[PDB]
Amino acid sequence: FKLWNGNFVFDSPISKTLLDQYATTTENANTLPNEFKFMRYQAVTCEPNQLAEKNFTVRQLKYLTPRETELMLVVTMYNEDHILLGRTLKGIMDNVKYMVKKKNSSTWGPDAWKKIVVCIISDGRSKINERSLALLSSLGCYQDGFAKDEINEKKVAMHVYEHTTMINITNISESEVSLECNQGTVPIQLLFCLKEQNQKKINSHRWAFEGFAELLRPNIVTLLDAGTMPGKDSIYQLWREFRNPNVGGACGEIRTDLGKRFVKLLNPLVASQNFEYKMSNILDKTTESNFGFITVLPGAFSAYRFEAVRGQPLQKYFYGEGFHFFSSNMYLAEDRILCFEVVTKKNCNWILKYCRSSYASTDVPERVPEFILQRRRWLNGSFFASVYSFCHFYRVWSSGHNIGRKLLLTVEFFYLFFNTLISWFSLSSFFLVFRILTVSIALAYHSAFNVLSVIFLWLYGICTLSTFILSLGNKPKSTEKFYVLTCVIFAVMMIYMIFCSIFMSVKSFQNILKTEAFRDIVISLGSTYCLYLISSIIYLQPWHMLTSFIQYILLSPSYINVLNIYAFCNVHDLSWGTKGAMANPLGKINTTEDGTFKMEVLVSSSEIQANYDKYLKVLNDFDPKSESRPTEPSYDEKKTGYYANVRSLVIIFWVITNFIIVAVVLETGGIADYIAMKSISTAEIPLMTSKASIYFNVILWLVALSALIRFIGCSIYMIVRFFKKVTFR
Amino acid sequence: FKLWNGNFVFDSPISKTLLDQYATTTENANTLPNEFKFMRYQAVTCEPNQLAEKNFTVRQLKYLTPRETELMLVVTMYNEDHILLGRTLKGIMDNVKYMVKKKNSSTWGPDAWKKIVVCIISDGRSKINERSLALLSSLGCYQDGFAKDEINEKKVAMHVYEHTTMINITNISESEVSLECNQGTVPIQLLFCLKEQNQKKINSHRWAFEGFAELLRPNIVTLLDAGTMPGKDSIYQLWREFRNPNVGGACGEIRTDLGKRFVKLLNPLVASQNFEYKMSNILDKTTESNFGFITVLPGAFSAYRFEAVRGQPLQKYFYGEGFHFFSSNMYLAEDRILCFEVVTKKNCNWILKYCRSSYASTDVPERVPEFILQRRRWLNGSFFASVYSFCHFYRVWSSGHNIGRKLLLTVEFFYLFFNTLISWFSLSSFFLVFRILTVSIALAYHSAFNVLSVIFLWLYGICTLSTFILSLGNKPKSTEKFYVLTCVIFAVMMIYMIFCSIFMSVKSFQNILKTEAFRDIVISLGSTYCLYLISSIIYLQPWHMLTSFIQYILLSPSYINVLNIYAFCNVHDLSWGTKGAMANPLGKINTTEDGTFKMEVLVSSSEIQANYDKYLKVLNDFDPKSESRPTEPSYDEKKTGYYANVRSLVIIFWVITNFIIVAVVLETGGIADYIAMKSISTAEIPLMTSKASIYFNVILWLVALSALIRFIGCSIYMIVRFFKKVTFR
Ligand SMILES: CCCCCC/C=C\CCCCCCCC(=O)O[C@H](COC(=O)CCCCCCCCCCCCCCC)COP(=O)(O)OCCN
Ligand SMILES: CCCCCC/C=C\CCCCCCCC(=O)O[C@H](COC(=O)CCCCCCCCCCCCCCC)COP(=O)(O)OCCN
Ligand SMILES: CCCCCCCCCCCCCC
Ligand SMILES: CCCCCCCCCCCCCC
Ligand SMILES: CCCCCCCCCCCCCC
Ligand SMILES: CCCCCCCCCCCCCC
Ligand SMILES: CCCCCCCCCCCCCC
Ligand SMILES: CCCCCCCCCCCCCC
Ligand SMILES: CCCCCCCCCCCCCC
Ligand SMILES: CCCCCCCCCCCCCC
Ligand SMILES: CCCCCCCCCCCCCC
Ligand SMILES: CCCCCCCCCCCCCC
Ligand SMILES: CCCCCCCCCCCCCC
Ligand SMILES: CCCCCCCCCCCCCC
Ligand SMILES: CCCCCCCCCCCCCC
Ligand SMILES: CCCCCCCCCCCCCC
Ligand SMILES: CCCCCCCCCCCCCC
Ligand SMILES: CCCCCCCCCCCCCC
Ligand SMILES: CCCCCCCCCCCC
Ligand SMILES: CCCCCCCCCCCC
Ligand SMILES: CCCCCCCCCCCC
Ligand SMILES: CCCCCCCCCCCC
Numbered sequence A, B: 001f002k003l004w005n006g007n008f009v010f011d012s013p014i015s016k017t018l019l020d021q022y023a024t025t026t027e028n029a030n031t032l033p034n035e036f037k038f039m040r041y042q043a044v045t046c047e048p049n050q051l052a053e054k055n056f057t058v059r060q061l062k063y064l065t066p067r068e069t070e071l072m073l074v075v076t077m078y079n080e081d082h083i084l085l086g087r088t089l090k091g092i093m094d095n096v097k098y099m100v101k102k103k104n105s106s107t108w109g110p111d112a113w114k115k116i117v118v119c120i121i122s123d124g125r126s127k128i129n130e131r132s133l134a135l136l137s138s139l140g141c142y143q144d145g146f147a148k149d150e151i152n153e154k155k156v157a158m159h160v161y162e163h164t165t166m167i168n169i170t171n172i173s174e175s176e177v178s179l180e181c182n183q184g185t186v187p188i189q190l191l192f193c194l195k196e197q198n199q200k201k202i203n204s205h206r207w208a209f210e211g212f213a214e215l216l217r218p219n220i221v222t223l224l225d226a227g228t229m230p231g232k233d234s235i236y237q238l239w240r241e242f243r244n245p246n247v248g249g250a251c252g253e254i255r256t257d258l259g260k261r262f263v264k265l266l267n268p269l270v271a272s273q274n275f276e277y278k279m280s281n282i283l284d285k286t287t288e289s290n291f292g293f294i295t296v297l298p299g300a301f302s303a304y305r306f307e308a309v310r311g312q313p314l315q316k317y318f319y320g321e322g323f324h325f326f327s328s329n330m331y332l333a334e335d336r337i338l339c340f341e342v343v344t345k346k347n348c349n350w351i352l353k354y355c356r357s358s359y360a361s362t363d364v365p366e367r368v369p370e371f372i373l374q375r376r377r378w379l380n381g382s383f384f385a386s387v388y389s390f391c392h393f394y395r396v397w398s399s400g401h402n403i404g405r406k407l408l409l410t411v412e413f414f415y416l417f418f419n420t421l422i423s424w425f426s427l428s429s430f431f432l433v434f435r436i437l438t439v440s441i442a443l444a445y446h447s448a449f450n451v452l453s454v455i456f457l458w459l460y461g462i463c464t465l466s467t468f469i470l471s472l473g474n475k476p477k478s479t480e481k482f483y484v485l486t487c488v489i490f491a492v493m494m495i496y497m498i499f500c501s502i503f504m505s506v507k508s509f510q511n512i513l514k515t516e517a518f519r520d521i522v523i524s525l526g527s528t529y530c531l532y533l534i535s536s537i538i539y540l541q542p543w544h545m546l547t548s549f550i551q552y553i554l555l556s557p558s559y560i561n562v563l564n565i566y567a568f569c570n571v572h573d574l575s576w577g578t579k580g581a582m583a584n585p586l587g588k589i590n591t592t593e594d595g596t597f598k599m600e601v602l603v604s605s606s607e608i609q610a611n612y613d614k615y616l617k618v619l620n621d622f623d624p625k626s627e628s629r630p631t632e633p634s635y636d637e638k639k640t641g642y643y644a645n646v647r648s649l650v651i652i653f654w655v656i657t658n659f660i661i662v663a664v665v666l667e668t669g670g671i672a673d674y675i676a677m678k679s680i681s682t683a684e685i686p687l688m689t690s691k692a693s694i695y696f697n698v699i700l701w702l703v704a705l706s707a708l709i710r711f712i713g714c715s716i717y718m719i720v721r722f723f724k725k726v727t728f729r
């Protein structure tokens, strides 16, 4: 063969069984376009940054009339099953089919399938699922065979497969995938590109944004994840948000999958997450979109404009530039930095908008060990992305917005840090609320309320201590039975804490009709629970305020005492290092010959004496006077020693600054003794002071105050969207 | 060559420069015995258990008159310097020289160097120090060259080098080693045997006890360690302990090296360990030897009788037989099991005796991070070896002792467990002593004693919490500067605690001459410190009660709060597992040809269709109805999950059972509130109760009581030895 400009570009045909299916579609089975009956293979053996410099090309450039690209759909995966992968492909194909049948459109039409380009980017050739790859092979986009790993002393970086198929999935069952090819199917051009070795996930986005997108030059770049299934017309609704030239990014809403006939609602750990997803798409995202800055939830469905993300925003996302705090830990925020660098771009004005008429369902974990490992990634990233934004809020004023937008963004950057500070102090708030409430009901009614207030404290301190020891030196998959018991214990504590307040409040009412507990039934149940229901009704989805609202309350104590403790003890996921310097000089003959053969035996007396004097000389030049610097750690074992130091300094500052709040309200830590000894000179300790009644009201005023802003923000968004709908109708 | 019975046995000569030195010794430089001018090499390529079964042999068996062995000295090492190795060899050579000049002896004499056989067992061929091996090469016991790694599809297990040298070291300086060969030097038979791959240290003892010792068949087997230097005649004095046939093992005493002209006494961390070594060889070892059961200190100098340790004692030391508590953690006790299985041997009667006229000096750590990592091995082994002995104390009565010895051993097995229980509860004892003493001086004199009692509690709780976080998820070599600060803080706390007691006691005396603090200067300073001095004077080494007694007191709080915390959080030294299943099918050509060459390209349409059909068939047979058992952990990654579970269960039971003692004396943990609420029905909390004065005397009575037994035991041993000396004179 004659390789093309130093590159191995091969062109193979397809199976005979597959071509016959395509032949039935046309009205004359004699000829077919070359794009429908071939599969271009090529090896890259270079970097994604210099893909266009090494005379590399894609299949879209070399046409009689060059094709333009309007949407580039990226779909990353890593050893997912062949059922999770099919769900995303089925959702993608239906949207493309929908966008073809549009009658009146200046962009889309009956020949609009030449714009969308699907791009699957797998990770690792030895880690991809065996069954998932067979699904791609059944679509005509994979052929076993050519896997050249090197070309002229150049290891290949990644393999590129590409083909324009005409088979789209019809129905995904629980154990089967239905494939069909009829007159009502649209062709989908695939660009399956498989990587060689495992390189995390940020490198996968580097192969797309800096790689193929640099050759195709699309308008919009949409990000997906294997498992997420877009809706019937979710692709089209998200594309309509770029009508005005100010938007530089968008995302829809994400929903949980309830199985078949709503069967997955009996699980207390699935119904709990069904209420948390709803309350995040109704109270938080709308309020963030009002100002003009949003952060996409993990697993969601997002799209960026390729003109906005080009240059500085992409330079500080991939590389980001030692061992400095804001440069070495910045990978923990995932892509939340990309959303922040777009709004604050110099001499430009881009805003992020939240679309509501585009949804994407997904599955959720149903076991406890698997559910803890997932939130570990979310919490560590949502905590660092708000500390980075607050310390760099001055960069908004160097942008190109007007005067109103800058002031509106500065307020939101403070309102987010206030929410972060509330969540940082939530470990010492729950204990104080639990302790000032059980004691206060024992000083008023006695009876059996005196022993129950001592059993629950010891049952709390034992479960809290065991979570710190099992998170610093153990895995959550080994000891699975203990976490379930801890969750049940916390749920029971929550039930008792709820009952005590109702009892005290009803007694207070009966003793004044026939105060800390008087306004406790007025602000924590009348102004917090009512606004949630009103906001849900306004959002026109009021069917989750009774379905799965009880289960979320019982698992509330396990969101701040089992999930925050594990997420802070595992920040960087270090691995130290073993290595080893095996003796390179080895394999001295094999003596395979049974006998006779003597090989080479040194008998040279002079050589023997030279060797003996060569070992005798080593003991001479030993003087340690010039003490050389000890062998410093490489670079891979010295960076690990830095991740272990910035992680032990966060656990200490999180425990010490939370115990100070407890030793100012409860007068623990030896402070009450100090007052008593000061009072015995000019001698006893009260059980409860007056500082436990001021604090018990402040921590409940902030809870209902933060639920008041989320209602005004949710209502303004709907009011504006209703007028937009009326005007555009 | 004609290999011997399936074994590669080669015989090389020595360097010409080395033979000339030997030639000067004899009175006729014409001939020399073959043992003095050759070096036998052999590869083992088998197991130590079956060394004699594969027709293997040593150089001592094939003589005109077979030689018998009286002492087999084992010297293990692992990447030690060439100065530490020379110190042991110089000490060994001087003892052999001393044992030759004895005039009247029925065993030793002028030709007694044929009995002692030195055996150096290095570990790892790629880990041995390159400079230390040159010292062996300069002795005529190593030749670079033949290092065959395989023979007829059989990997070599270990390499055997052996030669009878005649050069002994004269003086070891700080940077040089002096070698000489004169008329007053004795030959030493070396058996340097170098291992192939790193296999810990228990395997090294298996190569000796089950290996060479099975062919040489010695009388006594002495154990050493590179770095330990025996005394002038320490070998001979330890051999005299086997005169009577009841002894089945012995050991001497170990001392610290004070450098040159006592220069290493200025270090507070070296002087502290100088007083701990003395108090262990004067109060503990003598008392244990009185009963008849002793445990050798780490790094010491011990000897066993090969007849006593043969069979069951060696079968349960190496193998010891699942995942059971007393079978999987038994490797933590090192060789302390061997000492226990000798005394309780079935139908036999062996006792362990402690010799006092044989010493061996060694170096000690002088940095803090290096000192913490060493005691981590000692504490984890001395705690498990006493729990195993107490739960199996019934095995003494099945032995062959008389009636008195069984009763004497049963008492000692309880007295050791009592000492272990005292040390298990030492975390909550120091805090109680520190807290009941600083508060009590603030309720009597006020002034500045009210603020100092609150600063020290907060300064204690911050240093105690940071030691649990830095030991469960960090290495002690990284954060070196924090441990030094923690030690200084604890030392200052100790000084303040000492001053408070003296102040209170002198006030108590002055207020009765012109009670908890009255007998506090009578039992904790009059009956504890005096008995130490009396025992030291009786031992005839009373020069360490003022030299390094102050430094040991200041570092006393750091022996139970920095060393016990780190030793319990790191019990098994687990490493989890990474592994990885790299794609075995790989290496798809190299395409090295610049052009033209097409190699093999499949174009077979039928084969292509068959391939497409075999990838299409995988999606068919997928039915998950028969849910197979998930892939269980191998055996190496499942055992690690068991070591992590038995280690988190020890840290929890050590913290919970120590906080209960604090919540019964100080009435913390919510218990005082319970009493107050019970008292408000039929309402305040006292600062100090009467249980803090009963406990403060009990914990000081046990301290001076345990120092009273160690004096009687130390005196009885010396009284008996004096009569033995008088009778044997
Ligand atoms: C010997 C200890 C064994 C257990 C170790 C557990 C693990 C980690 C280290 C813990 C360090 C703190 C040990 C406190 C020991 C204790 O039981 O001491 C009590 C409680 O004292 C209080 O206030 C209670 C303080 C609770 C602290 C919880 C953790 C806080 C972390 C940050 C610590 C910062 C400094 C805190 C200093 C106290 C003193 O009671 P009292 O004599 O005043 O009772 C007077 C009644 N009339
Ligand atoms: C929110 C916590 C943040 C810090 C977490 C630190 C790390 C690990 C988990 C610690 C679990 C225990 C938390 C105790 C919280 C606390 O500050 O609570 C106090 C102290 O209470 C006491 O007694 C002091 C108890 C000290 C316990 C030290 C460790 C013991 C380990 C085993 C625990 C076994 C169960 C113990 C139950 C208490 C209640 O003070 P009060 O309202 O009675 O003061 C009345 C004055 N008139
Ligand atoms: C008569 C006053 C004392 C009554 C004590 C009753 C205790 C009942 C405890 C029941 C279990 C509580 C949860 C473990
Ligand atoms: C004088 C009476 C004292 C009674 C103390 C009762 C203490 C009960 C502790 C229960 C702990 C339960 C842990 C699971
Ligand atoms: C199979 C995984 C289940 C996870 C949730 C466990 C239950 C949590 C709530 C318990 C409530 C108990 C009320 C009595
Ligand atoms: C005079 C009425 C006394 C009522 C006492 C009730 C005690 C609490 C009972 C329920 C405890 C929590 C069970 C989960
Ligand atoms: C100095 C850089 C390394 C820090 C390692 C962690 C030190 C933790 C102990 C000190 C905590 C101080 C809290 C006020
Ligand atoms: C070599 C030592 C490196 C220490 C790095 C410490 C970085 C600062 C950590 C601050 C943590 C603050 C948490 C709120
Ligand atoms: C390292 C910082 C330590 C701060 C300690 C603060 C202790 C609490 C002081 C409370 C003062 C007011 C008491 C009523
Ligand atoms: C989550 C809010 C943290 C900061 C405020 C905490 C309370 C401060 C004390 C309030 C009570 C009054 C004490 C004098
Ligand atoms: C006049 C009564 C109060 C006096 C307070 C004096 C405090 C002195 C503290 C000195 C440092 C203590 C160790 C940090
Ligand atoms: C009403 C006056 C209260 C005074 C409280 C003083 C607390 C001092 C705490 C010192 C902590 C030092 C840690 C290193
Ligand atoms: C170089 C390593 C030193 C280790 C010991 C540090 C000092 C311990 C004792 C401090 C005493 C301080 C008295 C004021
Ligand atoms: C009436 C006399 C009062 C004396 C007060 C002494 C206070 C303690 C001083 C030393 C503190 C510890 C220093 C290391
Ligand atoms: C009374 C203390 C109970 C502690 C339970 C939590 C620790 C469990 C560790 C893992 C145990 C695995 C075998 C059951
Ligand atoms: C698979 C779970 C294994 C758990 C093993 C637990 C063994 C017993 C540990 C007891 C520790 C006692 C310390 C005093
Ligand atoms: C798991 C075991 C828990 C035991 C709790 C014991 C608490 C202390 C009881 C003290 C009773 C006497 C008080 C004066
Ligand atoms: C180290 C000894 C541990 C066992 C005994 C601990 C003290 C027991 C209580 C003594 C005081 C009296 C309480 C009623
Ligand atoms: C260079 C590192 C700076 C870290 C700044 C952290 C600020 C945290 C919030 C402080 C105010 C509550
Ligand atoms: C972010 C939440 C912080 C903690 C708020 C209070 C939790 C307990 C509420 C109990 C209601 C009965
Ligand atoms: C969550 C509530 C659990 C207990 C059931 C309600 C108890 C109400 C008591 C009212 C007394 C007047
Ligand atoms: C930032 C750590 C928590 C403490 C915040 C300040 C508390 C001041 C209390 C003053 C009481 C008089």
Ligand SMILES: CCCCCCCCCCCC
Pocket: A694, A698
């Ligand atoms: C973050 C908001 C903190 C508000 C603290 C208010 C404290 C008020 C003390 C006096 C009440 C009468």
Ligand SMILES: CCCCCCCCCCCC
Pocket: B325
């Ligand atoms: C099978 C495991 C048995 C462990 C026994 C431990 C005993 C510890 C001492 C109990 C009495 C204080």
Ligand SMILES: CCCCCCCCCCCC
Pocket: B422, B423, B426, B429, B430, B433, B497, B498, B501, B703
């Ligand atoms: C094994 C030792 C346990 C703790 C004994 C008491 C320690 C503090 C002594 C203070 C003397 C002034």
Ligand SMILES: CCCCCCCCCCCC
Pocket: B495, B498, B499, B502, B503, B506
């Ligand atoms: C270890 C002692 C440090 C303080 C110096 C001695 C103080 C003695 C005070 C006596 C008062 C009567």
Ligand SMILES: CCCCCCCCCCCC
Pocket: B657, B660, B661, B664
């Ligand atoms: C074994 C764990 C520590 C507790 C030992 C028993 C204490 C009993 C105290 C009884 C007080 C009335």
Ligand SMILES: CCCCCCCCCCCC
Pocket: B694, B698
């Ligand atoms: C291990 C020895 C424990 C001894 C406990 C004695 C308790 C005595 C209580 C009554 C004193 C008057």
Ligand SMILES: CCCCCCC
Pocket: A266, A267, A268
């Ligand atoms: C998943 C079946 C119900 C579990 C209930 C746990 C409390």
Ligand SMILES: CCCCCCC
Pocket: A391
């Ligand atoms: C770059 C660090 C800025 C800190 C600001 C704290 C208000």
Ligand SMILES: CCCCCCC
Pocket: A397, A410
């Ligand atoms: C130029 C910086 C202006 C900050 C305004 C904060 C409200």
Ligand SMILES: CCCCCCC
Pocket: A404, A405, A407, A408
């Ligand atoms: C972007 C339209 C003006 C906003 C002004 C906010 C004060």
Ligand SMILES: CCCCCCC
Pocket: A451
């Ligand atoms: C009144 C004391 C009761 C102790 C046992 C409660 C279960």
Ligand SMILES: CCCCCCC
Pocket: A481, A484, A485
């Ligand atoms: C899946 C394991 C369930 C254990 C329940 C313990 C209460």
Ligand SMILES: CCCCCCC
Pocket: A290, A291, A408, A712, A713, A716
């Ligand atoms: C349309 C701008 C609204 C700003 C205030 C949002 C709460």
Ligand SMILES: CCCCCCC
Pocket: B266, B267, B268
């Ligand atoms: C080793 C030189 C003296 C150190 C003293 C540390 C307190």
Ligand SMILES: CCCCCCC
Pocket: B391
């Ligand atoms: C084999 C376990 C014996 C336990 C004895 C406890 C006294």
Ligand SMILES: CCCCCCC
Pocket: B397, B410
């Ligand atoms: C046969 C067991 C006898 C035990 C005696 C203990 C003193």
